[PDB]
Amino acid sequence: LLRQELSCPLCLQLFDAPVTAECGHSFCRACLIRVAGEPAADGTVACPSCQAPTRPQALSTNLQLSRLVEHCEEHLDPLSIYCEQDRTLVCGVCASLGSHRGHRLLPAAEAQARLKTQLPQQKMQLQEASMRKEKTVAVLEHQLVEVEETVRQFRGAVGEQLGKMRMFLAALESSLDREAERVRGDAGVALRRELSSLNSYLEQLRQMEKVLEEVADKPQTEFLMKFSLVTSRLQKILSESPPPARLDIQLPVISDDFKFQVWKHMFRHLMPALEELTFDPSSAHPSLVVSSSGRRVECSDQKAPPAGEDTRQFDKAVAVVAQQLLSQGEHYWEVEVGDKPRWALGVMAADASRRGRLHAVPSQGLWLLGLRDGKILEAHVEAKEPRALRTPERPPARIGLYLSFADGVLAFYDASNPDVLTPIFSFHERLPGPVYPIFDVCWHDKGKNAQPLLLV
Amino acid sequence: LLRQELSCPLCLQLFDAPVTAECGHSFCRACLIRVAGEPAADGTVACPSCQAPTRPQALSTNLQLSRLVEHCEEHLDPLSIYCEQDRTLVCGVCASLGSHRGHRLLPAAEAQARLKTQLPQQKMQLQEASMRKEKTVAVLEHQLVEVEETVRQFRGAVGEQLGKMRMFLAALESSLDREAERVRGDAGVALRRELSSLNSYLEQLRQMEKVLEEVADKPQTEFLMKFSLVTSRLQKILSESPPPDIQLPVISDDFKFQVWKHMFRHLMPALEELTFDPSSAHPSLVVSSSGRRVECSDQKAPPAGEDTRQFDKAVAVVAQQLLSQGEHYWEVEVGDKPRWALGVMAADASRRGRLHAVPSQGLWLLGLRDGKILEAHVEAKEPRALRTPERPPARIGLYLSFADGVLAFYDASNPDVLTPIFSFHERLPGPVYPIFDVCWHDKGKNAQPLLLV
Ligand SMILES: [Zn+2]
Ligand SMILES: [Zn+2]
Ligand SMILES: [Zn+2]
Ligand SMILES: [Zn+2]
Ligand SMILES: [Zn+2]
Ligand SMILES: [Zn+2]
Ligand SMILES: [Zn+2]
């Protein structure tokens, strides 16, 4: 093992006084010194091999292998043959004795000729190992940068999740403390108006008391003069007898009901940017009259003219789609429905045969929903039969809708109060998209389906 | 026909030079120039009775008798006769001429004798006016203190309303970014260990290349030495052939909802480490663990006593303490309990007599029997129920605020978050007591141990 366990990959010197580390390794001194990079100034001097460090300040000087050691230094006979059964080089005397008296072999000259011939193949394996190690280096850089930049995206989402409600709270507190401060200004004006009034009154009253104290002993003429003057002024200020009442504030004060309604108002007012970039009539229909930037809809008393047959347009399906749709991000918009007693909403891809709303259900991804007669829901869902819902204790007025993607986050909830929305139903599952959601209003229907339909 | 401008009715002093201004009033200047309170030292422009735009240099004056005279002295006849149709006292010439040739009057003496008699009565009226002025000053101070203390309460509610979610967001971001930093540390440990490995590999590869470059032209002995050494080490490293992914739960797209869910939990109102009260305790509800955890067994119970603070038949529990301001939150578990009851009552109803005691007298009820048959009653014939959700119910949450009667108790099928399924709506003067009851064993299975906090 002079060349098997006593083979330093760095030195192959005359091994004596090996340095032992807490990793469980024995090695040489300058051989290990040849490794550069990490001095104790930058930190640990860990073993690059076995995940167990050892500082140069924890010397456990153990020379066990150096004392286990004992041309050739044993026979003056140079190393002679590499064993072909043991796969080991020894010297002729040291080989025949001990190790290699009983194996199969190949002669030394032939073996070294084989090696001197095969040299470039091992060099190619060397540069191939270098190529693989650099492939792994590139994987390392790509993985580390992808991780830290995904962290960049996550911390940015954190930043925006902060910013939404942070700016909301700042704006609400500022608005309402300025409201309170303007009430302060009004009350201050009132109190200083009464201040000026009553301050003039009492100041001149005490002036009057001192003046009468002086005038109590004047001759009869000016005596009566001042008497008449004071009589007139006192009768005037008693005619100006103001019957005063208190103020009776009705300022909305911080109770402990606010939390619910204010928290709904923020739950609504969480809203990213504008979606006032309108629709596409690419499959529009006859029976409707539109206005208000082409947005408010109804029907009128003019029979509707038919349309020539076209491939994309429906046979009769009187519905509407829009223009924009993405496959990333978030979007919001707001509508109202008025007194409309029957309508329908759903969504469809490029796959269905648009001409004909015959038997066609979300079984093929032809997603449906509708309602008749005020509140009578008809939920055609992944079952050929509709379902119903609540009859709420108040009529529904507006609608508001929002889209997020990764979960197929579809959102459409009533907004009968612009301060606060009220949920109706959702389906927490994913849709690939973007295909279009489509929305339908029925015909004139004798004028019964002819009452206005709002939007902004 | 007011003669009020004999002098200024608000100054009663020397030369005035009356101002005819756009306020609709006749003004002086020294009246409030010598005296502060409505001063020009800060830019005041208001009338103490109208508050109209007016400046002190719009003079349109009269100096008739001021230039004439230097006692009436318009005739060298002092004021002589008081007039009664107009309540004026003038001199014979100035009265009879013009003003007072045709009125009711008092010539000489009775009126001024009345005045000399009534002097102290008008002084007493002056004391009354002083008392009224002090009433108005006290109203001023009361308004000042109410205003500044309303500012106190509003700014304090603002501070705490900030602090709750401000500390919540800070804590959540800190916890999760430190979690991210620890994931960074893990990735750093992996990359630096592989760094040490591969840098040692390439460094000793460079050593091998330089050694072979130097030594490729040496004698055969050390040649064969190197041959065997490299053979052994290279077959060792080919045996050491490495045969080579974070699953971090990322934010969802509905993620905003769950973040709001956890905030809805950790809103952090006051803590209620104050459990039930055995002020009317009974046998079959054994309590332990600082009066928290309760059980019961198959040994019959001593019969009922009779006193003030004890129930009719209900072997049940009442509460110790309750105030009239603030908020109180808690989270509960029910185990496999299929039947129980909770409610609230005032100091008026009797705890004796198990007849149909109902919220008809404001004795508000809620209960459950037989697995999931909910029974929540108000003044009617039968208690009501609701949809029975599918995912198994585990835990409960409850909340109280006082001034608005904010009563709350909602499902918490995951203790992280509650979901509103059933509660009532009333404001109570209070504080009236919450009471709690568990029914019998029914072979043991109707009575299983109970917990809170
Ligand atoms: Zn060495
Ligand atoms: Zn030998
Ligand atoms: Zn051998
Ligand atoms: Zn004056
Ligand atoms: Zn005025
Ligand atoms: Zn006269
Ligand atoms: Zn008269």
Residue numbers in the entry:
A (entry chain B): 7 to 76, 85 to 470
B (entry chain A): 7 to 76, 85 to 258, 262 to 470
Which text from the study accompanies this structure?
Here we present the structure of Mus musculus TRIM72, a complete model of a TRIM E3 ubiquitin ligase.
At the N terminus, a catalytic RING exists in a bent conformation near the other protomer of the CCD. Based on the experimental SAXS profiles, the calculated models showed that the RING domain is highly dynamic and does not prefer the bent conformation. Additionally, an AlphaFold58 prediction suggested that TRIM72 has the extended conformation of the RING domain, similar to one of the models calculated by SREFLEX. Next to the RING domain, the B-box domains are located at each end of the CCDs and contact the H1 and H2′ helices of the CCDs in a hydrophobic manner.
